[PDB]
């Protein structure tokens, strides 16, 4: 009974600071201990610190003391973590997670059952670049898709029909080309008989560049 939603992915230059927000819906933030956890690529879970908005106090992992700052806003029901003096070692997915404060007092245990969707912060000197998007026309079932070309940095989300179409969808992990840019593809398998009557639109989001492209994918000619 609490939904945590995090701000979008970002690129940041070395030396700068990153702000990640964690907004709670269907629940009051001060009812929870909010914890921030990060994961570098292919690595484990690393605690950054936490906050009890009820008490207003925050505690920090010793590795991050004086570099990370964690606060909360009552009126917006939102928690915040800010990490400064960024280096490439801080490229990671940052997660917020909540546990009911009730149980920390009555039970002396955590139950981090509720997690934000995570936020990829990439630390890089290279400038953001939004993707070009091209339709992969379909020719029983048929595969159709969207090609998402030449963007930096990760990640990119692709939905279909504004999220209405989830079944049959496979978004492939991106290639990292020699040029330093990424490309990925997303494909959905649909009935061939539905083609030409039902519409298929891919919705591409590259949050680091604030690019949002919707591309209609139609049969050939």
């Amino acid at each position: 009974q609490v939904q945590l939603v995090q701000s979008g992915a970002e690129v940041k230059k070395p030396g700068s600071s990153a702000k990640v927000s964690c907004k709670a819906s269907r629940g009051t933030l001060s009812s929870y201990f909010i914890s921030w956890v990060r994961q570098a690529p292919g690595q484990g879970l690393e605690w950054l610190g936490g906050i009890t908005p009820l008490l207003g106090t925050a505690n920090y992992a010793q590795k991050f003391q004086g570099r990370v700052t964690i606060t909360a806003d009552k009126s917006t029901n939102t928690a915040f973590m800010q990490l400064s003096s960024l280096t490439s070692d801080d490229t990671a997915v940052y997660y917020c997670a909540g546990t009911v404060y009730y149980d920390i007092l009555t039970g002396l245990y955590t139950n981090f059952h509720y997690w934000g969707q995570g936020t990829l912060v990439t630390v890089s000197s290279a400038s953001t670049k939004g993707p070009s998007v091209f339709p992969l026309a379909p020719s029983g079932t048929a595969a159709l898709g969207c090609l998402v070309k030449d963007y930096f940095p990760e990640p990119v989300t692709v939905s279909w029909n504004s999220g209405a179409l989830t079944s049959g969808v496979h978004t492939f992990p991106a290639v990292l080309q020699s040029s330093g840019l990424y490309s990925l593809s997303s494909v959905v398998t649909v009935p061939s008989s539905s083609l030409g009557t039902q519409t298929y639109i891919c919705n591409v989001n590259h949050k680091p560049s604030n690019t949002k492209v919707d591309k209609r994918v139609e049969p050939k000619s």
Partner: protein
Amino acid sequence: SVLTQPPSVSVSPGQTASITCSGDNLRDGYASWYQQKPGQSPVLVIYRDDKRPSGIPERFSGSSSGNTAILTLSGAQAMDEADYYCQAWASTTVIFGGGTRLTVLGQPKAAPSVTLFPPSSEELQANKATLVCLISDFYPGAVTVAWKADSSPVKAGVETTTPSKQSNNKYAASSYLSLTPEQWKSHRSYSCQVTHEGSTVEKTVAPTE
């Protein structure tokens, strides 16, 4: 304050896996355990030593004694393949173990499905050309990808990913061949060729057709 769990454990399907986690704070305090499948957020499976959240299968259970907590998984299935993290809570500090990669053995071989898209009209109109070879549902997760232009190998313009785990625990990969529009139009066909477990899987596309 550190927590120690082994880096890896394998289990045959239907067998039981136990992952231990030891450390100072499991004596006085409680262990929680998370499951993390590739590409996903961590999911809590056990809290307060032995409590299972609603929605989590009964084959997951937890126990603890001394400074050692144990996550136990009955009737292991291929979908249970994941990293597992123990976590402690002491003063006002969350501590994580290093994670344990659970491997489920005995998964059957699966040849890869290939989808091959020619360049779109729109990309052609922008004076570029990319062939897209999507490779999915294979196991084991090792392939090599080669391209051909009219029966002859294509060295240049090839960009290939390494395999990655799908949801259904098979693998996916992709490969991209970049061409100029006139290259694309000047050949009778181009082929993506996937080598997997001693066999070769091929799709071809022709500018016409």
